[PDB]
Symmetry: D2
Subunit: 377 residues, 4 copies
């Protein structure tokens, strides 16, 4: 069978919004680790609207945070369709509803109730070194490489907006090759399409995709519209939380529907999904399964989860029901437990808002620190 | 194992946005079936912002469409925190990028290119009469029931914002029961929690959930914060395309990340996901599989898909690669082919923007009209 | 001849905007008296947009200030068309341009430059005890009376939005009577027009206007479209700085065009118009003229005014050249000096933003503490 | 004595707002001459918000009108701080309240009610050929000149945002000279202050201001903070109706407070101020006074003005009681009549939204076609 996963650069309008949302979250947490933040960002031709519900003792400069974020992304001139230095920054930030907060923050700190209801999924598969699905990891690297080539001036005619897509060929449940690649990138008007296609293939795609998976029958589509000068917020509206699949496992695993960026750890949409990646990775790391997918769910203002489910796809190396009640022993999945487990009350979330929340070494939910102590029990 | 799906009422802030987006799409398509529409809606305390990229010959009243939509949902008074008749309606609507239209609308009509790149999933499972996963269909019915009991005045203290969550117990791959239920609903200040919990238990949950699946160990969580007076856009920002899982299969199937509402059929994020539901359902209806999950993908401005994948979870009733072989013969999955297959150039999409896009008889992608022809060529 | 002036209530949309701008200003100055503030507010159905240029070390809660200000005004329910508790509050506040600031905050505070170029008028007349023109005085009193009988419950069907207008008859420079009165007020649907008109007459108009100026020839126009249920920002957009004649002299005197509200005192549009009122009032209180109009002008970044003019309409008691010299001697009109002269670096401005900036004698620019000095020096 | 007036260029943010509001009005009136339009515009860094109350059968492209208007003004690049092609255009346009409209559009068109209450002034003076005060005339000419030499490429480092101010010396009611001139203009970073100041002197100030009014005593203030690179909406919020003295008589005459731009002629704030200029100009052109100030006032939903006043500052050549009678005999100041008198139901307003509503004699309220009639009836 064929399988396909996509990713987007830091300049894609939805990722701009995600990044602004987590930039504001970060600034707040630097001052107020216990702040309640639900930051939703809307980006369109000429304007950033930052809104949502925040309850904090912190004082942050929404305008300067936003301009700085768009500046680092690279939109700094009207020729690119968007300029960090001259766009509108609007705030529509209110307070968190008192009807919600009475369910989260309560008497005993360890009794903290879930921020909301909802379902979250985690996933891990041994087919890569970082225990991630291959299609989404190489999609991320393709767009991450585009931004690095753009920023270090190797291809100065590049623009921030870009998307990648890769369609892998599988057999025996293992990678055979790559049947199709797509790399669409915004560009200045100076460069013709033929020069751009060759530069993308040589400088973007070949350094990232192992040539074994590439054949003469491997199909390539580079700016297949034939022109990508208009881009960023000018050609497409950007919204926080509209890339939740490229944020996670590229469609290789199911999703509960919860967005990540702009949300402080009290939101189980984020903190549970990180903890679900945490256990599913460790479970694989201990060789107890080849592939593992966890589903947890919560009720509003209720500490204990309402559902836990371990799925091994017929690859378990110990009975599945032993695997389930071992998750329950070595991981605390109540809201207060998620935050303690992963050391989450820190400004570490802007770095997550582009190129995937999962599969990066240093994230606390990526550490394989309980791998050994899984076997022993 | 236990599996959990959720859904939200038409009054949930994200669904308000989805509904406004598709309400605008509908008005446009009624005048201009060929319009290019990408309508993104942002709703917060006191305001609706309608934005996006539209290229159309149609003239529509964004303000009145929006107020009328919020009216029908039920926010018609400041006591509820939001009033269709006095909120701000802002428009930030631009034109579609010329660099994209040159890849969609090109030369031959049947050589039309995909609206974007992306991946889309479809799904069907025989475990319900409408071939949908059970958790998401009963989730949808719980909030759909909440809106109907609110609107016909049986529980007049109900307010439009509501959510449901059901935890099903599976084993043998079959439904054992329901281990947990959640029904959070916005309410007037008149009624206390005990009275509300009883009324929700009696008028909401019991008429909808088969009593067999309820035991006495079945947990019930009703307004578990203890108060749900503040609600709608006042308590929670609402955005178009932020309920893509409750829009589809409640997490039972994978998702490609594409939102549906506010998008005209030239966006493969919508029309392909509808066509993948179409083929995955008809495949099950022909008895060729018990459960079937389809993945297709496209490259922007390219007619033919870049990937097709039929996954039957080991429940196939014919060889797997003959099942992929037949999808490619009796279904045209190029952009123009999707639209012809399902007759999508019609104002039918507002009805989809709440209570699921899948599992409702009348949608063109729910017809079981190729079921027999798939068993023939099998 | 006939002369007409108008005023508007604290609930008129433009005055809502002025009051929010100056509420924000006051909140900042309480923490940072030397803040640079140019706060512009836009109010329309369902939303308040607070924008402008602010450089300050203060932190103020724009949302809470706005809601509290709109609450005090009385818009607290969707039936009124606007609700302080559920409207959107958006911010678009930037920083003051450093290109402007280097001209204002120079190294030497004594050389503080004018915050902009421009011209400003001050006026006084011994026609009333507070040395204001009579038409604007009584126009303010009518809308202040409307607000009082609304707020104290006398006429609870009144809504916050209202306007007044009075046409006076003059003969040989003296008021002889009132020729026409207009009073428009928003109201609930519960009251019919004829009953409203009688109540406005008895409770608003007759207690405020002197009876000896009202005759059988006086025309009274009360809600003369026949209906005023829709009002506030729903019926009419409100913007800061769009009531500058109501704010000053009601058309009796000239105006240089600069708005007041939302501006810190380094904006000479505000501080130099207060100073010009101060010198005009003190000239008339000193008995040196019956009527006095002062023009002053500035260049941005320059301390010394570009012009000063004293106009007394033939009423002067000492030569006009003497009066102009007395103004130079007794008043500092450089920005540093006038801010110190009037003690302007305090949170005193929200109070000015409805019912007129002049004629209320606890304002520092209304003190006549230089009148005896001027009478002596002349 | 000294008297001062100011003006602003088409690129000043308040004037950007006035021009967008009147461009919207014109686009609507081209399709629907009887539309009810109250279009209010707010411009700040990166965004234009077009709002207000409009009832019309026209459809106009608000975005395209806004972008085209800002392009014509000259903000077309982020280096300038504002870009017509990449700024946000938001709409918050509602409908006119039917409670207002039932008072305006009554069954009998002759009984058309005033769009609001309010007071309006008109003014004329034989100080200049167009019968306007000299200070606002020359202040307008300075910023018009700034825009001209920016636009024709003479001084290409000029940017659109600019302001002027002139202080005239009067002696016995005549201009004797100019005491001070202010000219502030946004500019690119490529030019230094002293070079800019000399270029502004030579190319903007000296070709416009009479040389006999400029002496060694005249003070010249050119970009007196020392830098004006940040400008336009980035430096200063723009709002419709925040230049109403620049729009009219530069402070020489009184004002009733109503803004002009974005309003259709049923708003007497605009149409009755145009009418008041028309009757004042015709009185002075008829030779019946040297300067003349008219006040008119209305009640909302009422056709007959609540007051009319004729002030001639002692310069009248016939009794002031007779002048007021001539005004009532020769001018119709009811809303129906004044809209007919000045033929106001046409897309003519965008042109008014910068460089002043008065003094430009192709406008219909600038015609002196009643002066000879007034001259006859007075004797
Ligand atoms: C703009 S498209 C979606 C279609 C759009 N909403 C419309 O109005 O039709 C979404 C993404 O595709 C990318 N994109 C935009 N223009 C493109 C072009 N000419 N070629 C390839 N990719 C493009 C951008 O990263 C953009 O965010
Ligand atoms: C708690 S959530 C998201 C968290 C929120 N953004 C915050 O500020 O923390 C809000 C959503 O859940 C529902 N909700 C809001 N308040 C609720 C309450 N007291 N009890 C149960 N559900 C509530 C509403 O449908 C609303 O859309
Ligand atoms: C909150 S900060 C002051 C913090 C700063 N570190 C200090 O104390 O000097 C004030 C700046 O942020 C901007 N600002 C935006 N919103 C503001 C708000 N509600 N209150 C105060 N300043 C605001 C203004 O441009 C203002 O100059
Ligand atoms: C609404 S009117 C201005 C014209 C209006 N914007 C339109 O669309 O025609 C301006 C002010 O007049 C007052 N007003 C509103 N409705 C009124 C009514 N029905 N009768 C009398 N005055 C009214 C309110 O104070 C309002 O702010
Ligand atoms: C009614 S018109 C469309 C004309 C239509 N044929 C009719 O007669 O009803 C559009 C209405 O929506 C509002 N509107 C919003 N945006 C508009 C726009 N760009 N152009 C004209 N009207 C607009 C106005 O209140 C206007 O009355
Ligand atoms: C920006 S200033 C007014 C006060 C300003 N809002 C503040 O924050 O202090 C008003 C007008 O003066 C002009 N202006 C802006 N910057 C200027 C500068 N550096 N020098 C001279 N004039 C300037 C522009 O026409 C601007 O619209
Ligand atoms: K208005
Ligand atoms: K006078
Ligand atoms: K300003
Ligand atoms: K005069
Ligand atoms: Mg998107
Ligand atoms: Mg969610
Ligand atoms: Mg949401
Ligand atoms: Mg998508
Ligand atoms: Mg107004
Ligand atoms: Mg000013
Ligand atoms: Mg201004
Ligand atoms: Mg007015």
């Amino acid at each position: 069978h064929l399988f396909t996963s996509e990713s987007v650069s830091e300049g894609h309008p939805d990722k701009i919004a995600d990044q602004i949302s987590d930039a504001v979250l970060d600034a707040i947490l630097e001052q107020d680790p216990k702040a309640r933040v639900a930051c939703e960002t809307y980006v369109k031709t000429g304007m950033v609207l930052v809104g949502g519900e925040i309850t904090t003792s912190a004082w942050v400069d929404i305008e300067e945070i936003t301009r700085n974020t768009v500046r680092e992304i690279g939109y700094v001139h009207s020729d690119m369709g968007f300029d960090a230095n001259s766009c509108a920054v609007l705030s529509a930030i209110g307070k968190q509803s008192p009807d919600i907060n009475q369910g989260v923050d309560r008497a005993d700190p360890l009794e903290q109730g879930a921020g909301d209801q909802g379902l979250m999924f985690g996933y891990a598969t041994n087919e890569t070194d970082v225990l991630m699905p291959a299609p989404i990891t190489y999609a991320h690297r393709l767009v991450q490489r585009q931004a690095e080539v753009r920023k270090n001036g190797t291809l100065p005619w590049l623009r921030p907006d870009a998307k990648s897509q890769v369609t892998f060929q599988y057999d025996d449940g293992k990678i055979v090759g790559i049947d199709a690649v797509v790399l669409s990138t915004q560009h200045s008007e100076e460069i013709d399409q033929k020069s751009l296609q060759e530069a993308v293939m040589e400088e973007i795609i070949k350094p990232i995709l192992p040539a074994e998976w590439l054949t003469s029958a491997t199909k390539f589509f580079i700016n297949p519209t034939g022109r990508f000068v208009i881009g960023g917020p000018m050609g497409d509206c950007g919204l926080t939380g509209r890339k939740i699949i490229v944020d996670t496992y590229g469609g290789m695993a199911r999703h509960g529907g919860g967005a990540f960026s702009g949300k402080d750890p009290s939101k189980v949409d984020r903190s549970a999904a990180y903890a679900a990646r945490y256990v599913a990775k460790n479970i694989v790391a201990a060789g107890l399964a080849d592939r593992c997918e966890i589903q947890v769910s919560y009720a509003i203002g209720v500490a204990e989860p309402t559902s836990i489910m371990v799925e091994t796809f017929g690859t378990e190396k110990v009975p599945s029901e032993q695997l389930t009640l071992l998750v329950r022993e070595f991981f605390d999945l109540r809201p207060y437990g998620l935050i303690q487990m992963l050391d989450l009350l820190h400004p570490i979330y802007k770095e997550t808002a582009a190129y995937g929340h999962f599969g990066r070494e240093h994230f606390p939910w990526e550490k394989t620190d309980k791998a050994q102590l899984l076997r022993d029990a």
